[PDB]
Amino acid sequence: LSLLDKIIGAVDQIQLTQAQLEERQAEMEGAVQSIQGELSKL
Amino acid sequence: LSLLDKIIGAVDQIQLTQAQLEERQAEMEGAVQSIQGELSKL
Amino acid sequence: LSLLDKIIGAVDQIQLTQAQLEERQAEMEGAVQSIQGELSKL
Amino acid sequence: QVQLQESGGGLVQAGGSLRLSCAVSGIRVNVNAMYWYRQAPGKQRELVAIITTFGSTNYADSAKGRFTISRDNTKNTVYLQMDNLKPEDTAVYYCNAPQFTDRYWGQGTQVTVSS
Amino acid sequence: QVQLQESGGGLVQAGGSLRLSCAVSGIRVNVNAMYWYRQAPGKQRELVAIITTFGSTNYADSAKGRFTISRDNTKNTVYLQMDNLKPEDTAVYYCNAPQFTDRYWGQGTQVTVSS
Amino acid sequence: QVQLQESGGGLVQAGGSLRLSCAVSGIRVNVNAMYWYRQAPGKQRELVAIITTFGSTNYADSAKGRFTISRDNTKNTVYLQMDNLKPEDTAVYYCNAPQFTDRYWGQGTQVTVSS
């Protein structure tokens, strides 16, 4: 197991995690926008 | 195009994305704090 | 200071930052869920 | 600039298959992780599938084993194979790289699935 | 699949020490950053400690210098040494890799600290 | 520890230019991505500019082509050139690395732009 194999697997872990963190952010942005609409409606 | 060029470009993509995800988090933290203030005010 | 030392230190910075961004997300998810409960309660 | 040219959408029957393509210019798909997204009318953009620089893949739960993301490095093109399509998959589908989602979106490709 | 087998918890007196272990299969701990989490009853999962691929560490503020994360590459095992334990540390402790926290959790190891 | 020593701020007329400096110790700027932030009175900290390990740059929309981040590897120093300054740019400016923004901030450098 080379340094390059370790670097590659770290990069892969990071990219997978970034996609999951973005999806979580989008879910929460929808929830917050729904709350803002509830508190802002006439 | 070497393995190192690929690794470098992946790292660059990741760092740019991390800065954008942080900015999105700060915007949303301000929005949530504004909602909390609206629901917490006397 | 080699290209590999730079790559390693970038990866390390990125992984530390990802753990911090996740913790911030969890704190905010708790705050948003508390707001949702306040606005949803009977 | 980065160019994103999505194609391969259309009108398909439920249970049918599509293969979407995104022809990319200005970045190498064998260097960058690439994402497919979809957006149904009036709904938020949903991440659908990702392929990493070194070829690992992940899918949204809505894909549930039906979708396969791949790429051709020579054509610098990203593909999304979609099997057993359902009416709920009707949306405009977009390909992007994560560092540009704040910056530019292509026209997308319309996918309409009818029963 | 990835297997996560946590052990080393138990009942400990305040001021005591524990060393938790997570035996990992399906990924290499010397390739992947690895995290320890804890979850107290009815509370949200809290990140406790992280060790990166190249061995840098970070801790939650609640650890405040008491915890040390480490690994054995040959045993493919991640450890969390916990000194000067407090009743507030009572929780189930879990080890994971960040790319799988949306996907799978092991059974955890119960840590109970009594005065 | 990491040391961050910001300088180069001051009082400048609208349409004027500044070049901020941050002298860094304890990490290498040619190894770490480095960020410039600003904070106006009573407002949230805003990310202004980033430079990656391998020299790619990005700017907040408020920069809109006016700002240029750069570094000197020998001096281990990060720079922010700011042209066509506006009163709305009045703030304290801070340099940091992303892994330390939860941990430490320098004193910053005050930038005041008057018409």
Residue numbers in the entry:
A (entry chain A), B (entry chain A), C (entry chain A): 57 to 98
D (entry chain B), E (entry chain B), F (entry chain B): 2 to 116
The article reads:
Cavin1 is ubiquitously expressed and is essential for stabilizing the caveolar domain and promoting the formation of the invaginated caveola structure. The cavin HR1 domains form a highly extended trimeric coiled-coil assembly and provide a core structure thought to mediate intermolecular interactions of cavins promoting homo- and hetero-oligomerisation. A positively charged basic surface towards the C-terminus of the HR1 domain interacts preferentially with plasma membrane-enriched phosphatidylinositol 4,5-bisphosphate for lipid-dependent recruitment of cavins to caveolar membranes and membrane-remodelling activity. Using the mouse Cavin1 (mC1) HR1 complex, we immunised alpacas and subsequently isolated two high-affinity nanobodies, NbA12 and NbB7, that specifically target this Cavin1 coiled-coil domain.
In addition, Thr104, Thr105 and Ser106 in mouse and human Cavin1 are reported phosphorylation sites in Phosphosite, and insulin-stimulated phosphorylation of Thr104 and Ser106 has been reported. The second mutation was to make putative phosphomimetic alterations in the Thr105–Ser106 pair (TS/DD mutant) that we predicted could disrupt coiled-coil formation. We determined the crystal structures of both the mC1-HR1(HT/II) and mC1-HR1(TS/DD) mutants in complex with NbB7, hoping to observe changes in the folding of the C-terminal region of the HR1 domain. Interestingly, however, although both structures were obtained in different space groups to the wild-type protein, they still showed a lack of density for the C-terminal region of the mC1-HR1 domain beyond Lys97. In both cases, the C-terminal region including the mutation sites was, therefore, still disordered. This also suggests neither the HT/II nor TS/DD mutations prevented uncoiling of the C-terminal region when bound to NbB7 at the N-terminal region. The binding affinity (Kd) of NbB7 for the mC1-HR1(HT/II) mutant was moderately enhanced from 520 to 142 nM, whereas its interaction with the mC1-HR1(TS/DD) mutant was improved by ∼8-fold with a Kd of 66.7 nM. Surprisingly, both mutant proteins could be purified similarly to the wild-type mC1-HR1 trimer and they did not display dramatic differences in stability when we examined their melting temperatures by differential scanning fluorimetry. Similar to the wild-type Cavin1 protein, confocal microscopy showed that Cavin1(HT/II)–GFP and Cavin1(TS/DD)–GFP both localised to typical punctate caveola structures at the plasma membrane, indicating that the mutations do not prevent the ability of Cavin1 to form caveolae (with membrane-embedded CAV1). Intriguingly, however, although Cavin1(HT/II)–GFP could stably recruit both Cavin2–mCherry and Cavin3–mCherry to caveola puncta when co-expressed, the phosphomimic TS/DD mutant of Cavin1 recruited Cavin3–mCherry but not Cavin2-mCherry, which remained dispersed in the cytosol.
